[PDB]
Structures are given as C-alpha cells and as structure tokens.
Design a protein around this ligand. Structure first.
Ligand SMILES: [Cl-]
Lengths: 290, 209, 289, 210
C-alpha cells in the first residue's frame, strides 16, 4: 500500500513504540520512546492504537515522501516548524498529506526529540514484540537512512479528530528534576552536592544515558565494588569519576554503579527533551535520612 | 523467612536486598508466583531483586503486599534439586587464558576443565548484553580475578571466568573476563522461540568436547 | 529581479559577510561570519567576490523559495544534507535552482553553522559598509524571519564552475584548539590548568562568546581591575568566576577581563563549528614562559 | 621615546603597553600616520594600543616596523584651540552616584556638577559599545574609582565617571562607572551621517539642564 520514503534523517531517526517490557529474564531492556508523553500524543492525534510505532527524530531535519495514497500525520515533541512541500502545518496537530508530497521537519531551538506519527503506524517488522530500536544492544529496526521505504499500516480513512489537552512548553534553559533519594546515597561523602550543583549536559548523552558534568561526587570508599543490580530509566548512576549519568530508555538491564537517586515518574519524559549544553538542577522529592 | 531491606527505587520500583544469589532466585520465584498487581518486571541480580511497577500508585500497595510474603527455606538452594540440570553446554577448552587460570587457581589445565565440567552452575542473573548470563554456584576453586585490561574482541561463544562467576559471551564483543574455551551453542537468537538460551534460575552443566 | 523568500529559519538565520573592520574609533566591532573559511568557500563555489553576503544558519532548518528567475547556490560548513524540493544535492557543491523551487537545509550532527551563498550575493542594504548582523549591538540586517524577501544581487554568467580543494570534516566531539599564551597569563595562579582541562561548551554560547565550564581558573589578585583593552575574536577572557569565554565575531571592541591566551588564526574558524555540550581542549601554540 | 612592551596578541595582532593615556594617544597618531602594511585596525584604550593585522604573515614584519617608529610630537595639547568646543552635551544631574562622587572627591554635589561642566573634555578614544567615547582632560578633581561591582543595567544616556575618564553610555547596558546624570542627546545612530556623536580628537562641553 502506502509508504514513506526517507529522503534525509537529521542526526538520528529511529522507529520507536512503547518498547519491549518484561524481558529482563533474557537480558533485554524495555527501550521505546525517550519521551513517552509526546509519542503517545502523536499516536492519539492520528487515532492510532497506543502500540503503533512513530519516528523519533533527534535535532529535527527528517524528510520523507508519501507514496501510494494519502496519509494523516502528526508531529509532537520539540517544535521543528514542520512543513509539507514548504508549507508549515504546526506541531501537535493532525495534517493530511497527499500522495507524492514531502513531509519535512526543521530544526528546533527548544527541546530535542520530535515524534512523527502516521495513521496506521510505521509498519516495520517487530523484533521481540516491539518496533523500537535499542541503541545499546542494536535490537529492533535499524536507525533510518536516506533511501529507506517504510510501510504504513492498514487503517480506516475516516476517524474522529478529538479535542486534545494543551501541551506544556519544553524548558529552554535550566531543567529542574525531582529525585527520590537512594538506594546508594550512603556511598557518597556528601550526597547533597547532587542537589546544589548546576549540572551541565554533555554531547555524549544518548538513549543509554544523559551524561552530566560538574563538581564530582566523591565515594566514601573509592575502591568499593557494587554487585550488579537491576536498573530503570531515570536512575542516577555515579561512576568512579563522580559525574552522574541519568539512565535513558536503552540502559542495560543491570548495572554496576551505585545509584544516588532516581528521577520521579512525572519528570522522566522531561529527560527526553534536554539538549547538550543545558543545565540540570536536581531536587530531593522528599528528605533523605539514615 | 521474611524480607530484609526494601528500598524505594524511584517512585515506581522497589529494590529488595539479599545476602546471597540463592535467596535472590528463591524470592524471585515467590514474587513471580504472587502475581502482584501492577508488576511490569522482576529483575533478579547479584544481591538484589528489582520489582518494576506500572506506576507510582502501585508503590505503597506493593510494599504492603511484600510484607505478607514468605519464602520456604528449601527454595534457597545451592545445588540442583535432584541433581538434575536444565541444559548442557558443550565446550572446546582452547581458551586464551586457560593456562593463566591454571597458574592463578593453583591447578593444572586438566583440573581446571574437570572443575568447570564437574559442578553444575546456576544462572543467577542476566546483564552486559542480551543472552549474557552470570553463572553462580559452580566449583569455588575456579575463582580467578578479571583481566588487568579488557580485550578489544572476544569471540561469540567464549566460555569465561571472573570472580565467583562463569559466563558465555553471546556475540563478538570487548570483554575483561578470563577465557577458558568456546561453545558452538547459540546463546541468543532473536528468531528462536526462547531468544536467550539461559534464563535466571536455570541449572547448566558444561561438557568438554 | 530574483529574490529568496524565507519560509522557515531554524534556531537563527543571519545575513553575514566579512564584517565591518576598522571601526574601533566609533566603538563598532567587525562582526561577520563566525566561520570565515566556510563563508568564503560558499562564495568561491558560486564565483562571488569574497565580500558577498551569505546566510549563516545555526543548527540547520532554514528554507527559502526562489522567485523571479534561476539561481546558482552553494551550502558550506556543517553538513545539513541540503535539498531542492526534498531532493538532496550535497554540501560544498554549486547547485542550480529554478524559479519556484524550495532550497531546504536539514539538521547537522557535526558542526553548528552552515553558509548559504547565492551567485550575486544576498543584496540586502549594507549598514556601516557591511551586510553582517551584530547580535550584541543589533547593527546590520535583522535576524531572518519567515516571510522575509531577500534580493539576489546582479551578476554575470561565467561557466564552467571552478573545482575547489576538499574540505576536512568538522570535529564531532573533542575539539583541540591551539592557543598563543598571553598577554595576561600572569594574572592566573596556574595558567597551565587551561591546557589540562576538558572544557564543556554551554548553551549560553553565541557569536559574542563561547562559554566554557570546568575547574575555575583562580586569579593571583582577585580584586585586581584590568583597564579596558582591545580584544579580538578567539581571545580567551577569564571573568572573576574563572570560567573562560572565547570571544566570537560579535565581541565588543574593548573588554575588561584578563586574556589568558588567544586562539591561533588556523583554529579561529573551528570555533564557529563547536556545538553546545561538546568538549574543548586547549593547547599552547608554543611554550609558555 | 621608544615603545615599551609589545605582546603578541594571538598570531595576528600586537598589544602595545603604555604608562599613561597621553602616551596611548600620541602613539595612536604615530601608528595611524605610519600607514603600516597589513594593519586592519588600531585600537587605543586606557593603557594599551591593539594593532590588528590582516593575517599572521604581518606579525613579525609589523613588530620590526614598530621598532623604527618614534613618537612624533612628545609635546601635546589639553585645551581647545580658539576656545571653540566641537559639541555641547546637555545633562540632567540626577545620577544614582552623584552624592557618592561628592563624598569620594571631597566636594559637594553642586561643586561636582560645576567641575564637570566647567572644564571641556577631549574624546581620547572609543570602545565598550558603538558610540561610547572615553573622555579625557576634564577637571582632575573629579577622579573617582570604578564601582566595586558593575550594575546590571545603566540607562541609555547615562553620564558617568571612572578614574581619569568621563563618558556617556549610548544604550541601556551593564556598567561599572560612577553615574552623575543623564543626557537626551543621541550618542549613536546608525542612520545619521555621522553615526557616533563623539569622534576621537573632538572637544566636548557638558552643560547642566536647569
Ligand atoms: Cl597570513
């Protein structure tokens, strides 16, 4: 049927969905969209089931041509001024694209990841029940390249274009995050450094984790090895160098670094919109105690 | 017995602390069998169990339910019950570090192979890569430290040792473990009905070929 | 005549050229393209004189429609996979666009600034003899907006097109920069820390200065005031907080902060391609004494 | 008189050091008159002259040419000839630091205004911002130090003092100078035939609004 031909990708264009939960027994991480709220919205706008895959675009710059029929699309997350044959259409809104037309996302100034949804979804072959690409293990559909032809799944042309809840703007400079203290905050000489430091986000940040730099967190016992433990996205690992890492959707199932704190659920999607060079400020969700 | 320390791991997960891998594997079974509401995954590891929940609302109700759970002492096992193993892995003992392991353990290469094949191992936890299983409860004489510097490339099917663990590298990758041999068994295959050959709680027997 | 109608800009699209030099006597900075080599390259590819204005695009995402005739263009600097009506044409190459077609730059993964040149140049009105926009004093053609109509200057039709020397790829993470020590390295307790630190680039960086963060450089006399002195782009100022700032094209003519070192001419244009969150490593061009 | 320290300022400029503004100004004219090959700009400032060059190739040859230069006058002027002042700037003496300047100079606010308006100033050099002129040769009694910490915002047209200088802030900006009043005169206008109101060498008279 209908396909999307990738003309240009930008820095990183991935097929993403809800991921592959419950697979730790085989060493497979959940993966999925880095900003779940934006991904879910893109799919709701085009009336897709919530399982449908979208294209997660990093720093904008993604272009695709429609072939074989008309499509309904939506772009959420970072505002890239999306256009169809040069005519802008607006982020967070359904847009009808005709056979032969070019969907083009620009470059955002605020935020990092945008989600392109298409009614019927990006119908690539699932891997371990998910169409999500896992950056670390390389499991799922390969990162998109120019020349790739993506199938659009089956759908009914008629659907209700429902009134959606307004979208909160993405933080342009300082990102404030709530952190549940622990479980290994006792490993650090002064764990409160975490919550009084202007942490800078580096260009080494990816879907495995966000790398922060600032005043290093020193260990009480620097040679102490933590037995490997299960991790989650939003967990703040502190490697021996003392520079915190906030785990992303592609984090490995287990890790060997002490976790000082874990970002609360409400603030986890904010991480998917933090650009390299931005400042992150952390705050305890509730006081820590021995 | 009852649970020890139960940490809040963020607002939608719980990290249960244990003194041994055997306890981690027994409480994993207890938690799996309890079929708790809102549980997305149960992650056993070296000395802990991570219970991942669907949302913050499940945290307090899970903590309460967890308090009423009990594990039988019998479920905490260090040898296979009935000596019966789940899988047998055939290994060619031609590893790069076989002679080094011999020197470090105070054994001959013949004794190293015999110890590795003589005592079954339990898959404690998965990590590092899909299909990479950290094996425990094997011959304690084999305890050897990690390599000073990791190798750039270790082959796919490399049978190795580090600390209290044994493990099989699923694919070609960098690795700092002590290499004792190799297998032709497929550790991980995405198209296979059971993608990972080794699942936590399983008992493995190594066989020399 | 022929024009380019701006459809979309991306984070920041500015008209830039070689700047307005020689204006210190009126307190006006030179300004101009942040990456002079790429800017001059884009003009040479279209056979423009070096003085012709280009469009300096930040983080890509710039789109323009051609009206009133055909144009010859080139895109240099950060590789944004530029396209005409969605079809890519390649960075560092002359490309011919027809009346009604859309030139579109994508988003780079490496580098920050791209230069769109057009044969005849971006013929906007000069301000103090330059078509460069100065972000600090707001002197020059205003930052581009959707709806802006940019005139294409008059030009002859000289064919064939001259082949240019290949371009070295832009540093993807760690940027290594050569620094001439001084003149105020004596103001710092340990100036050598400058050349032993992984400096991180903040999102507060702009054409006025690149802001670096790391272990602060301490002053030997913290309350000492430096009388204002002439500055240049590439000069490394050390404000009292000890976080170095590498001055860009839009730095004011004079500054009050001690300068620990100045980036060499060979490496000054590399500064225009450093993305926020990247690592900058500094090295003495020659031994410090 | 010969040059003092000549620093390499990167690989395409030279920073000349001087003990006084009078020497900076004398050397600026000497350099300006020498019309040296590869010189893009000559940037005089309080105690230095920055000679900007067209490329690294000009650095060592310019250093050599600089060594052959001799300060042309040695005899200078600090009074307007014919008593004709080039421009008169009308000032409302309502500055935030007027009372502070009075305390520091050992004068009353009335004496501060009278000293500022009583002796004409010469525009020595420009810097800081477009249209910002560093004024010299005014009443020496007005010599006051810079503020401990700079202000976040000083209003456009702010008439100020620091060290041996007086100056008028052309636009709203941060500033560490001592503020004595304000003017409605346009220091800088890009569309005016002479963009900057004050050019080096011009004589300025300040006049109190009232
Ligand atoms: Cl040169």
């Amino acid at each position: 049927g209908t396909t999307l031909e990738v003309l240009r990708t930008g820095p990183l264009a991935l097929v993403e969905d809800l991921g592959r939960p419950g697979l730790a027994h085989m060493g497979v991480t959940r993966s999925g969209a880095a900003d779940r709220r934006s991904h879910t919205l893109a799919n709701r706008l085009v009336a897709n089931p919530g399982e449908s895959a979208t294209i997660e675009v990093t720093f904008g710059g993604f272009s695709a041509r429609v072939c074989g029929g008309d499509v309904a699309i939506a772009v959420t997350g970072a505002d890239t001024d999306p256009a169809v044959n040069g005519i802008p259409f607006g982020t967070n809104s359904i847009h009808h694209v005709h056979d032969g037309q070019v969907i083009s996302l620009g470059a955002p100034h605020s935020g990092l990841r945008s989600y392109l949804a298409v009614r019927g979804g990006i119908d690539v072959t699932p891997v371990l029940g998910s169409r999500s690409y896992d950056v670390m293990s390389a499991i799922g559909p390969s990162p998109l390249r120019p020349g790739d032809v993506l199938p659009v799944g089956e759908h009914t042309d008629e659907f209700p274009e429902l009134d959606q809840a307004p979208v909160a703007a993405i933080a342009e400079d300082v990102v404030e995050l709530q952190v549940v203290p622990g479980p290994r905050d006792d490993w650090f000489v002064d764990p409160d450094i975490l919550v009084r430091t202007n942490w800078l986000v580096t260009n080494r940040s990816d879907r495995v984790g966000m790398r922060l730099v600032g005043m290093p967190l020193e260990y009480r016992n620097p040679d102490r090895q933590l037995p490997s433990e299960g991790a989650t996205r939003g967990a703040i690992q502190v490697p021996p160098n003392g520079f915190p890492v906030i785990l992303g959707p592609d984090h490995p199932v287990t890790g060997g670094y002490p976790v000082i704190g874990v970002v609360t659920e409400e603030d986890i999607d904010k991480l998917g919109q933090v650009r390299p060079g931005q400042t992150v400020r952390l705050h305890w969700a509730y006081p820590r105690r021995p | 017995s009852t649970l020890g320390t139960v940490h809040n791991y963020g607002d939608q997960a719980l990290l249960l602390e244990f003194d041994s891998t055997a306890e981690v594997l027994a409480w994993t079974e207890t938690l799996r069998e309890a079929e708790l509401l809102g549980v997305v995954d149960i992650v056993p590891a070296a000395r802990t169990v991570l219970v991942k929940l669907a949302g913050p609302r499940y945290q307090a109700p899970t903590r309460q339910r967890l308090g009423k759970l009990r594990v039988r002492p019998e479920a905490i096992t260090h040898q296979p019950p009935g000596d019966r193993v789940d899988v047998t892995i055939d290994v060619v003992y031609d590893g790069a570090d076989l002679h080094e392991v011999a020197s470090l353990t105070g054994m001959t290469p013949a004794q190293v192979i015999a110890a590795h094949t003589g005592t079954p191992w339990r898959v404690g936890f998965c990590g590092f890569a899909p299909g990479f299983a950290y094996l425990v409860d094997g011959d304690a004489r084999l305890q050897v430290p990690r390599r000073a510097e990791p190798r750039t490339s270790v082959p796919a099917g490399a049978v190795a040792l580090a600390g209290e663990f044994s493990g099989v590298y699923p694919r070609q990758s960098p690795g700092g473990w002590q290499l004792i041999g190799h297998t032709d068994a497929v550790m991980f295959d995405v198209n296979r009905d059971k993608p990972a050959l080794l699942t936590p709680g399983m008992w493995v027997q190594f066989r020399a070929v």
